[PDB]
Every structure is written in C-alpha cells, then in structure tokens.
Design a protein around this ligand. Sequence first.
Ligand SMILES: *C(=O)[C@@H](NC(=O)[C@H](N)c1ccccc1)[C@@H]1N[C@@H](C(=O)O)C(C)(C)S1
Ligand SMILES: [Zn+2]
Length: 822
Amino acid sequence: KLAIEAPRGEIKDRYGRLLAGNKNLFTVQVSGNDINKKDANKHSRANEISLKLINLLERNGEEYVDEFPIYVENGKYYYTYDRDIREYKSENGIPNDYNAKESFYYLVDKLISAGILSQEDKRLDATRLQAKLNENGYYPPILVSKWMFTAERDKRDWLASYKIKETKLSAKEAFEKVRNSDALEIDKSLSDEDARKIMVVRDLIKSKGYSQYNPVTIAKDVGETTIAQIEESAMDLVGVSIAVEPVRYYPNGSLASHMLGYVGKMPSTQIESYLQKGYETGDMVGLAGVEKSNESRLRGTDGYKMVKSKKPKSGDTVYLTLDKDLQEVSDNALKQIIEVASKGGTFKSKFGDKPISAYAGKAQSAALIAIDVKNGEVLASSSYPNYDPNKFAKGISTEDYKALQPKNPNDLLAGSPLLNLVTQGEFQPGSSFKMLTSMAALENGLDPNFTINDPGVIMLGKKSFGDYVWNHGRGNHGMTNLYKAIQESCNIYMATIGTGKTWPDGKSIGIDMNANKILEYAKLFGLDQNTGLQDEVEERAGKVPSTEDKLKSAKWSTADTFNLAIGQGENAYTPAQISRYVAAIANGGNLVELSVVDRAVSSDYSSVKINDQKKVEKIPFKNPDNLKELTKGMKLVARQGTAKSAFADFPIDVAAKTGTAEKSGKIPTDNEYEYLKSHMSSYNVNLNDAIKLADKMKAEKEKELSLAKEKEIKKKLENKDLKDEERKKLEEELEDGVKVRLEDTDKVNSSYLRKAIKELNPKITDDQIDRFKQDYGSFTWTVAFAPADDPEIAVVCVIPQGDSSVFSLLPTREVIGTYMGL
Ligand SMILES: *C(=O)[C@@H](NC(=O)[C@H](N)c1ccccc1)[C@@H]1N[C@@H](C(=O)O)C(C)(C)S1
Ligand SMILES: [Zn+2]
C-alpha cells in the first residue's frame, strides 16, 4: 500500500485568472538502504558519496536541505535547539537567564496583569494552567512534566540516538562525539568543514526513522547541469537519483497574500493531529488564508497502489471573489503611499498626481478593502506590509520566517506582515463613525437643518474638546447644520446631537440622545458582529463598547459621550467591519454578510456557488430614508469638504468621509523592570542607589504586612470556640514568626523601582519616565461608496500614523476609478 498524492486544487480570481497553482521541480533524492549497506567492506560507501554529493551541488550553486542541529557562525559551534529557546524568550521579554519553569510563570504573570487570567488561577495543576494558556492562544515551547523546554528535550533525544547519554554541555565537543560516533564512524583524516557536510546527509537520512520507507529529498529544486552530472556520475553515487516533485506556486507573487495565505510544513505540534486525518509526514498543508480554510477541498482525494492501483482525484478549483485587476491597483497604490512617505516624493495617479510630504516617516503599515454593497462580495483586500506565499512553498520555517516575518513592537498595527490588517487590526474608527452618531440622532427626531453658531470648542471640563481647526488656529465652522457638520467634520456639532444637549449654556435640545443610543446604532450597523470572513480566512473582529458591562460592575460621562460620538474612546473595529457599516448607508440600509470565496469547480467542471447563503438582512431602522441625509453630507465631503483636494475634479460621483484618530498613551513593554533599569541614566539617577532604595521600600512594606498579619492571627486566636485543627494552624504560622513576602512579579518588582526613581529624582513625571515606549499613535482613514446616487462599490482605506488625510484618499480614488472602468 503506497502513498499517491492528489494534485492540489488551483485558487483563481472571480474571472478565472490563476492566483495559486502547481508546478513540477527536479529534486535530488538519496536512498538510505543503498548509500549505507556494506557486504565484505568494513565501511559502507556512505560518507564518501555524502561528501561528493554536497560538493557537486555547492559548485553548481544548488540550494540543499541542511537541518543538522549544530552550526558554525564564526568558528563557534552553536545548537539550533538553544538559539530556538533564547529567540523565544526575546519575543516575550523573559530574561535569557530564566530557566523553563521561571520562563513559564513569567508568561502567566504577564497575562494576569493584562486581565486575561486571575491572580488565583495563577496557581493550579501546571497542566490545567498550560491548558488555560493554550485555549487562550499562547503556546509556550515547554514540557510542564519535567519542567524543561521542548527543544532542550529534543537535544537530549538527539544525543540519545547517536548513543551519547553523557550530557556534559558542549557544541564543538559534542560535534566531535557525533563525528567520531559509533553509528556514523567518519574518517578521522577528514576536515571538520567536510565532516559536517557529510553529517548533513547522514543526519537527514537517520532522522527519517528506522524502516526507511522511501528516499530522502536532499535538494528541492535543481538546474539542468546537476540532473546531468547525477545521472552521468551514477556509478559513484549509488543511492543518489533525480525525481520530479510538484511544488505550490503563486504566479503574481505577493498579490493578495493574506486572503490566499500559504502552504508549508505541518507545525510539529499538530503532525500527530494530521497523521490521524490521513496525511503522509512530508505533506505540505494550508497554514493561513483560503489555502487553510479550504485545505480539505484543495487537498483532493489521494490514491494508492500495491506493487507486491486507484487514481487520485485532484482538488476542486476554488474561485475567490477578488478581481485580479482591481487587487493589483490596491496592492500597488498602498505600496506607493508608504514607499513615497518613506523619505519623501510624489504619488503617481492615472487621475492626476499629488506630491506628499517627507516628514510623514512614522507610517509603516496600511490596509484597504473594496466590497460589492449589494451582496458583500470582497472585490479587493490589501494589507501592507505583506509576504510572498512562494517563500513558504518549499518549507522554510527554520530562519527566513524568523528573519523578516514577525516585526516591531509585538503590537501588530505597525508590525507583523503575516497579519491581515483588513480583518485583524482593530483600530479606533475615527470620524467615519460620525454618520452613525448622526443617523441615531436623526432617528430621535433631529432636523438636518438644525444650525449652531460653532464655538470651535466646548470647555465642559478643566480640559477642552474642540474642532481640529480650533485646536490649531483660533478655529470655527460658523453657521453649522448636519450637512456642514458632516462636510467639514465639526466635532462640536457631533457632541451636541450626541448628548442631545447644548454645552454648557442651555443643556437639552428637542431630542432624546445619549451614548447608549450611539452604541445602539453602532450595533445595528453590525460593528458588534463578525463580517462573514471569519470562517473563510483569519479575522479578529472588534466589539461595540457594552453600556451593560459598565452598570453590572455609573452611566456614561458626558466626555465619554463626546469622544465615543466622533469614533474615539473604546471603539475599535476591523476595516472589514467599517466596510459593512458603510455598505448599509450605500445600499439603502441592508447589512451584507461579506464573502471572499465565490465558487468551486470539480475535475468534472461541476460548479457550486459557495457565497450562496450569505445573509443580506434588512437593518430595522425606524426610517431608512434617514440614510439619504448621511449621503447628502458625505457627497459634500467630496464636492467642497475635507476630501475636495482629491475628489472635486473626478469623473465619478463619490460619497466620502475622512478621519484621523489619536489613541492616547504608550504601548506597554515586554518587561517593565528591564525598561526602567535600561533607562535609569536618562532619569538622572544611579542604578545601584535606585535598586538598593527600591529593595528598602519593599522590605519596609514586608514588615508593615507581617505586623498586621500577626495582629490578625492573634485576634482570630482570641476567638473561643475555634476548633483545635484551626487553632493549631494559626499557632504554627506565628510559632516561628510571620514573614510576609510580595509576589516577586514584574508588575511588583517594577512598581518599587519606579517609586524609588521618583524619590531619588523628586521632579521627574510619570510621562517623562515612560517617554521611550512606542505611542499607540494616530490612524488616518477614508471610507467612500460610488457612484453616490446609485452606489455599487464601498471602499475603506486606513494608514496608521499617516501625516495628512490625503494618504487615505489616494488609494481610495485609484480603486473607485479602476472599478468604474476609467
Ligand atoms: C474625526 O476623526 C475628527 N478627528 C478628531 O476629532 C481627532 N481628535 C484628531 C486626531 C488627530 C489629528 C486631528 C484630530 C475629524 N475629522 C478629521 C478628517 O476628516 O481628516 C479632521 C482632521 C478634520 S478632525
Ligand atoms: Zn465645528
């Protein structure tokens, strides 16, 4: 019974253009049996052929599998195992001199402090506590049982297999054992550079198991020269052969990488899982995006033979909803606005260029989605930075995935390229949320023409709330009704109808409006629900701030109402959510369930519409004609409002709202205590003096708590009728002396170091102490639907930390333009 693998189903675009398909490659395979069987010779020919093969490939410039666990970086021998531990610790802020148990709890402490666990949960059966981490999404490479790192155990089991049960820690000395090994018995005459090159092949073959099912692929892709010299030089290279193997390939490279996703190695965690589902070991699998969601479908139905014969059926071809041609525009447009904002320059546009400032340097990431407002079909979805799915095809999880794929600063809004910002970046909505505020107000009787003489600022607090024009110059909007409000983005107007009062001069207006009702409408526009993509691709949906979860643990502040009413406060939603919200305005008030997987076609050209059952459910508005006001305003934004700069001389009637959201405060560090330490000098304090003092403050608190604990125990002991067993426990506490200890978390250890800094420099502020941390920063937005009077397309474009609002409009214009067939 042999393993005949089915050809992987293709992924195509809406119109049938190949996005992901298969191609054949020449691999160099090596037979274990053949290379290292002997008859009369003491030594097999293995190490002689091994050394010959690598050198051959090396000369010809062929890339070859090298998963031998000891490397040479600068005459220094290092374990891959070990590098893997200390690289894991960096990415969580665990001090590299922490052992596995210490490393483990550090990660628990991390999440308790973060409101993900409780201080009580902190102690449990480690297995139950690991089970709490895993289901919660943190998989930390540690064996709870022996309190040791997986990759350290694997270092044991490797030295066990070459019968080196003596674990004196060594890399170069261990290399020699394995070289001069019983089971490999290399020539002592040879070079140490040559020996490793042999061990590469010898360890490959040895790691694949005892029974040695089939040959072993030593090089996954080779030129015409090698295939000649391996077939030619056949008499030397006994076990060596050429095979043809199919690989996955993405013709258009990184185009739509996140939606498509990628195939790679089974994550070793799950190998067991996949072998129970009937996969072979060498098999590649869907790891992200549609490649993963439709893994079963694309996998096909593989076949078998005996040879002591049934044909495999190929995977169904999966058609996405994306337009290959609209996707290119959106990927290219996002790529431009970041690379031009990098340094400086200008943005080229089929629809008339614009130069952009150089000092917009903080902007690294960006996202954009365009959907069919009638049926939720996702026509283009684009997140930057991104990745070439082709680099995972072969199975490069060792290094190049660790080199460039996870990124700064373990907060993904500016960071990792694997992240699909369109479905996984929760951002502050911005002022797009203003048509949502307005809708609810309109629906509580507001007259669009209600006009106010614009202060530019409310001074309800000691602190001030004001229009952007009033925050820069002494600003004003003057005579403002809803239409001018939406058109120039007046924040005051929005606060006033938000609260349904006038501040602070008259209080109530003719309408019953409040933060709860603003969130009631946010809910109705489906900002509380998953988009529809949740089961097609990786999505991390936002949640509408719960008014109910405030009460059960007073009401909403009338400055929590102000912010919330202009897309600030705890609002935080994916751009794909915002896409549905805007679609509902655009399509007369219908909440469309989004789709990115359109249909599938079998080998036998049978088809099926997958996005067939996608809810298009009518939002129960007290009067959907109200949505016509939101448009009327949104059109003025394009005609003579904030977005006039880009949309005024534009063939298409476009309804747009701009935005920019400032999220307050700093992004917390991996390790607060290390932070304070590494920044002590800049606070004009001495580390030793700071540390010493912090320890004194802790010892001072430990005493204070001991004294009180003592009083408490003595008081319990004064209680007559206190069953003996308890009286004995309370006595056994005291009987030695009570010595209370603070936990020795990072939250605690740091709390004191901070307190000590504040003493030793009595003028320094908290903000000054925290200046070196990353800012959550600003995010600049644009949402639009076209053509305004009979809309077909809704587009949403976010650039976190973009300078002007023009960065958001320019990709939204290119995409609108291209869709409309200009
Ligand atoms: C909506 O997002 C509004 N933005 C704000 O109120 C923020 N407090 C803010 C953050 C960063 C810079 C300035 C203000 C209005 N809409 C914006 C737009 O459409 O571009 C705005 C700049 C007119 S303010
Ligand atoms: Zn105003």
